[PDB]
Structures are given as C-alpha cells and as structure tokens.
C-alpha cells in the first residue's frame, strides 16, 4: 500500500506556508527516502529528488541527500546518482560548505579508486 500511499503525501509538497509544511517536509522527505531504502527504490529517489529539486529549502535537502552512504545498498548506483547530486548543486556556488565536499571525498575516491 505504501508504494501507492506515497503519492497523496507527496502532493502537499507542492507549496510551503507554515511550519506544518516544514514538518510535512521532515516526515514526507524521510518516508520518501525510507521507501528507497527497503527495496532499492532510492533510484526513484535520486530521480524523485531531481524532480523535487527541479521544484526549486537547502538545509532541508542537506539531510535528505546525506542518506547516500548512510544506508546505501549498492556502490555502483551511488556513483552516478551522486554525480547527479553534485551535478545539480554546482551552479549557485553557495554549497560545498561541508556536506557536498565530504561526499566528494567519498564519491571521488571510493567510486573508482
């Protein structure tokens, strides 16, 4: 059911008003990430994120992109996905603060070595 039950939860992500939208951001952005973890559904999640990232809450996204190797089933999948995460986060130049750089260590050296 949860695979179908995810949609009506992701809908209200369409906008941000009160702190109930950042609590909805917490819970929904954790479950979406969570759905990815159980059956390697995160591929959608990288893609899901790009769609969601196309919708643009930077530090709201910092934690959700943190999950890369926190709980990653396959190393190969991570390479190109992370390549897409840095790939998308290049532009504004505000990032690389901590988290992007520390996933560039991991991504660059671990991905290929």
From Swiss-Prot:
PTM note: N-acetylated by NAT1.
Family: Belongs to the proteasome subunit p55 family.
Organism: Saccharomyces cerevisiae (strain ATCC 204508 / S288c) (Baker's yeast)
Name by which UniProt lists this protein: 26S proteasome regulatory subunit RPN5
Function: Acts as a regulatory subunit of the 26S proteasome which is involved in the ATP-dependent degradation of ubiquitinated proteins.
Miscellaneous note of the record: Present with 5710 molecules/cell in log phase SD medium.
Gene from which the chain derives: RPN5
